[PDB]
Amino acid sequence: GVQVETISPGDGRTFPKRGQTCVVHYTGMLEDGKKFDSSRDRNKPFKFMLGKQEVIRGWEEGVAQMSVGQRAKLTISPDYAYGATGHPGIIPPHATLVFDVELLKLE
Amino acid sequence: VAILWHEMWHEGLEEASRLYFGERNVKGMFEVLEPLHAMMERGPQTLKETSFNQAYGRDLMEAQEWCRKYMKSGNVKDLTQAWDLYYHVFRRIS
Numbered sequence A: 001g002v003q004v005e006t007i008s009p010g011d012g013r014t015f016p017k018r019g020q021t022c023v024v025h026y027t028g029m030l031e032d033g034k035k036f037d038s039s040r041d042r043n044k045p046f047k048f049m050l051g052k053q054e055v056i057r058g059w060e061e062g063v064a065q066m067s068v069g070q071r072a073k074l075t076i077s078p079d080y081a082y083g084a085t086g087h088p089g090i091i092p093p094h095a096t097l098v099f100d101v102e103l104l105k106l107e
Numbered sequence B: 001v002a003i004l005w006h007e008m009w010h011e012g013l014e015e016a017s018r019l020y021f022g023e024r025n026v027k028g029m030f031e032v033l034e035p036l037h038a039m040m041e042r043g044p045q046t047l048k049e050t051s052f053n054q055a056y057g058r059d060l061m062e063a064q065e066w067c068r069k070y071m072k073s074g075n076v077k078d079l080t081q082a083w084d085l086y087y088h089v090f091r092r093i094s
């Protein structure tokens, strides 16, 4: 599935609802720590609407159980991410992904 | 048919990103995008096409260039640079 490990706690009550827009900062890396993408390198947050299949399942289920302010470590199985095909040239086949993602606010 | 450039690029980009990101279809991605870039090439004929062009014209032309570079290089990195610009214009059109 996806494992969620807390780095810094959120307020414990403000969670995202389906259809809400989640504003996050993320740094993504392969399980060996090789970074492939980071919103912090760009200084601008990432937005996506929850429960719309805009993002991979691991993000949908992982971020859903985070509360505002919380910085967590998402360990995502290839099943909840890019699968056997992966993403050609970027993410290899059958890759477990690790995202450092902080839920900044809900809109 | 008659279509606003605002609307044409919105649905066009949604389609292209579905095909590339969702279905791994880069050939199909080129199919939907090329017509929209061709329309821009003949140039604005209304006030609404003129204002759209003034706002988003440079970004779209630059994105087409990164697609063009991908074509020669094989560097998937060049396609992502195109989509960075496409995402940018999309989220302003919305």
Ligand SMILES: CCO[C@H]1C[C@@H]2CC[C@@H](C)[C@@](O)(O2)C(=O)C(=O)N2CCCC[C@H]2C(=O)O[C@H]([C@H](C)C[C@@H]2CC[C@@H](O)[C@H](OC)C2)CC(=O)[C@H](C)/C=C(\C)[C@@H](O)[C@@H](OC)C(=O)[C@H](C)C[C@H](C)/C=C/C=C/C=C/1C
Pocket (backbone or CB within 6 Å): A026, A028, A036, A037, A046, A053, A054, A055, A056, A057, A059, A087, A090, A091, B013, B014, B015, B017, B018, B021, B022, B023, B080, B081, B083, B084, B086, B087, B090
């Ligand atoms: C600069 C290049 O940057 C890319 C993102 C890169 C690509 C490669 C990835 C290593 C990565 O580096 O992200 C990455 O770190 C990462 O894996 N992410 C991005 C951050 C959120 C988690 C995950 C992800 O789900 O990406 C996903 C993943 C790649 C594809 C998803 C996966 C779930 C599927 O359900 C869906 O099927 C279609 C496609 C990409 C996105 O988050 C973007 C925003 C969203 C989409 C493309 C689709 O939802 C699309 O649907 C038609 C839309 O509705 C969008 C809004 C329409 C507009 C026009 C498209 C804009 C394109 C934006 C593209 C970018 C910013």
